[PDB]
């Protein structure tokens, strides 16, 4: 017969590598908001993959644009042009107003290619001498798992045990605008990388102007200010970018994950020629790169965000989560916080209660999130959500709490 | 109307970054050996996408494997777990005879983690002082464009302009058993990762008996045997991996590309469980890594090289590829090379003749070829390729050789 969910989790033991420890549930299903096991369950999703699925799971638009263009052409490689790419990058171009796109597959590749450009810009143009460019990174950042991008990580976990590290990373506190002007005083540094809000550091929401203060700062030393969207992106938190709410532009913009709708994955770097074109023909790519396939789905992708109005119900359902959040008792839960769908609590954990057992009976109770941290949970669903909906799922996160 | 190829190249140059320069073809459809322009010209398609369709383009059991799991769930994160992952795990360790396999996306996303995988294991089971782990590379490798994949390269386009760089990365000459070997009296040596044939060096095949050499000393001084087998892998040279031409077994094993057919960035690192396991939950991963769609797609590229027998067709059909293109003239092409299906000529470059007008006169005769230097011409279609197309193609080769 079928697998059965521990048989799922046998089997992965068994074959698989130990890298992750997920939260027992085996999905085999999805659609919009929710997902089903495979005993049948059903499940709000307030994970959403990391907000790789805010158009929600298999929406039809995505999955047409993926089994039209399979049927055409999937890869060519980059060593010839194929018809689809230039389209892609017309597109997304023109949407967030910058020259021209960089198009690799995962976060973490258009992370490591800002850095390449940043330090490329840095001798070729600012005029540091090889090899003194210097990148900073504020404090608990995540941006995957290469050794370059563990290499400016704050967090033990992500680092330990893999070094030696890659030079010219600097790492400052997040949310500081004087930590930030201390270090631009060097003037090897050739660029500031910092996330608007940052995710797996526990949705840490800088205080207001801050990123308004980081342009300021980058632009008067002549540092390239590196914003990264990959999670805080694509309607996530109520605006296309994060860095809207404060109406900031950054020298090179990184995008992800929800760039796809979870179909493919695509990534982009967004910038201008000056920076772009640091970069000559065969010094950088990716196999699968600005692949036909992958531009279709992400094309649709964006289309979604933007017919569906996604970012104004991010906004208005965000306000909703975070009101209703906060009227739970303040000796349970210690913080809420957030911008639009990008939200997460904190709970006063003790030794015998932590926010891995609060997921298991959420779980218990038909949705899924995942902790962050011994006292963190991480609220983010789906854009497509709707409010009666989101209140339905409020009244299991309240059930959920209090029952313990 | 329609767009026109030069409409095609002159809009990726105006809003796409300037990271390739491709050879003047735009591709809008591809079936098995066979690509179509926007103008309706067909032609041979002699490169694959670097062997990432090695099963040719769109092939439709894996087209249908696809469209099958997209009406059902395209990805969870590995936050939880899903039904399709644990399938594929069992099924391609079973295959290459590992216990265990870490899922990851692109080809260097697969060397940076085994990159990890060989600095863990030297720091947790081999002993070596943090942080003093080496790892050696051959000069003229290539596996990918991150930070640390050109820390290790020998190809000034690769690293000029990028650094600094990351340290505890050793180059010793390829095809080199002598100098492994002094490399290796290094205690704090990790592991050495090698290609069986190195790809964008120009098809550079090593001598007989390389392979079992490095082996050999690596067995003895406890240092991990890595093959990069992201381009030769999987049918190309004429066996599932280019080390079995010496019954050789690596420490770990990087397969990329060809593992999706050319449907998705799919990517795996095999090793057994003393290597494996030194990495613990939490401490590696990727968003789009491991998720069902791509698994779904995995299984079906590595079920067409199995039930087809490309491996037995690449390898038969490469010795008359071989053989015909050393008829050519001496003082014209200067060597041939390869195993399989994975072939390179050399030509007797001049200052008005080279390998790109080789390449574009082949485009115009109906063969779509890529030079991976001023000299160097790679052969490498698709294995579905039938001994009829194939002298179809040679006939077009020496057409176009021969009329300068
Ligand atoms: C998830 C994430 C990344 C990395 O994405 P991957 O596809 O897993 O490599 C980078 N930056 C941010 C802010 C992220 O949330
Ligand atoms: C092409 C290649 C890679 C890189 O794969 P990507 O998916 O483009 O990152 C790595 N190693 C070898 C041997 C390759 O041929």
Redesign the interface.
Known sequence: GP?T?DD??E??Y?????????????????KGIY?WD?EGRKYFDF?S??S??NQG??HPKI?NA??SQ??????????????????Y??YI??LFNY?????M?????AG?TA??LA??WG??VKGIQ????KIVFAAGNFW?????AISSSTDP??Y?????????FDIIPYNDLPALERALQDPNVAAFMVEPIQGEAGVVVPDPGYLMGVRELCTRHQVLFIADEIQTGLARTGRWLAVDYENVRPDIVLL??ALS?????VSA?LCDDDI?????????????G??P?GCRVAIAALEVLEEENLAENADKLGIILRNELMKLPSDVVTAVRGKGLLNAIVIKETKDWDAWKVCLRLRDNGL?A?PTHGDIIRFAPPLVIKEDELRESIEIINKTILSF
Chains 1, 2 share one sequence.
Do not use: Q, W
């Open positions: 697998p969910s799922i989790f089997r992965e068994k074959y698989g590598a130990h890298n992750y420890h997920p939260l027992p549930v085996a999905l085999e299903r999805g997902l495979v994970l993959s990391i790789a699925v799971h298999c999955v993926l089994k399979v049927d055409k052409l999937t890869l060519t490689s980059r060593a010839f042009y194929n018809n689809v790419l230039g389209e990058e017309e171009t023109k020259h021209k796109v960089l198009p597959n995962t976060g973490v590749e490591e850095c390449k330090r490329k001798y070729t090889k090899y003194k460019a995957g798992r290469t050794l370059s976990t992500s330990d045990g893999f070094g030696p590290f890659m030079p010219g992800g994950k709708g979870g179909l493919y994955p770097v772009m074109l640091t970069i000559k023909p065969g010094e950088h790519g990716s196999t699968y600005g692949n396939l899924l995942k």
